[PDB]
């Protein structure tokens, strides 16, 4: 396991424009296209990210490419974020994957708001960090996924994903 296999499980793969759990237009492996309700807006953005007239469908490769760029960005955002970098850096490898997953899902700003769990993760207070993070709208909205990510922070193993 690694970040790619992990997110590929949590986000799935779809080659046609679909709506995410929030109702937004997305494609491939969790690649958000727009928060706009217009499918036209969705299609334009897609043609732009792909660089061709897709007609709302891409190939697997195109999806894979977008995903690579998306992880890269997520990591780089972490690294650039003064509240995030320190946590990330104090973490072992499995746990970092959990941190990238959340950033991938809710953006750095979203993650950066878990002030208290972040501090607890930094102190290696796993159980505590896990109980704090479950008190979130993130957890109540996508409970299955949140549980797998939280267990990963708690145990530092991939069990939740086997
Ligand atoms: Cl709550
Ligand atoms: Cl879920
Ligand atoms: Xe977190
Ligand atoms: Xe957590």
UniProtKB/Swiss-Prot annotation:
Changing residue 20 to E/Q: Loss of 99% of enzymatic activity. Optimum pH is 7.3. Changing residue 26 to H: Facilitates transglycosylation more effectively than hydrolysis; covalently bound substrate. The active site is at 11 (proton donor/acceptor), 20 (proton donor/acceptor). Its main location: host cell. GO terms for biological process: cell wall macromolecule catabolic process; defense response to bacterium; peptidoglycan catabolic process; viral release from host cell by cytolysis. Changing residue 11 to Q: Complete loss of activity. Changing residue 117 to V: 50-fold decrease in enzymatic activity. Belongs to the glycosyl hydrolase 24 family. This is Endolysin. It comes from Enterobacteria phage T4 (Bacteriophage T4).
């Amino acid at each position: 396991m690694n970040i790619f296999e992990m997110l590929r499980i949590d986000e799935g793969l779809r080659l046609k424009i679909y709506k995410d759990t929030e109702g937004y237009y997305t494609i491939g492996i969790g690649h958000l296209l727009t928060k706009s309700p217009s499918l036209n807006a969705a299609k334009s953005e897609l043609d732009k990210a792909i660089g061709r007239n897709c007609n709302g469908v891409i190939t697997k490769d195109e999806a894979e490419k977008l995903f690579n760029q998306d992880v890269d960005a997520a990591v780089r955002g972490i690294l650039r974020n003064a509240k995030l970098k320190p946590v990330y850096d104090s973490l072992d490898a499995v746990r970092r994957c959990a941190l990238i997953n959340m950033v991938f899902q809710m953006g750095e700003t979203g993650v950066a708001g878990f002030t208290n769990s972040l501090r607890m993760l930094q102190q290696k207070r796993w159980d505590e960090a896990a109980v704090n993070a479950a008190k979130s709208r993130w957890y109540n909205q996508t409970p299955n996924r949140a549980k797998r990510v939280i267990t990963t922070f708690r145990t530092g193993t991939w069990d939740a994903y086997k």
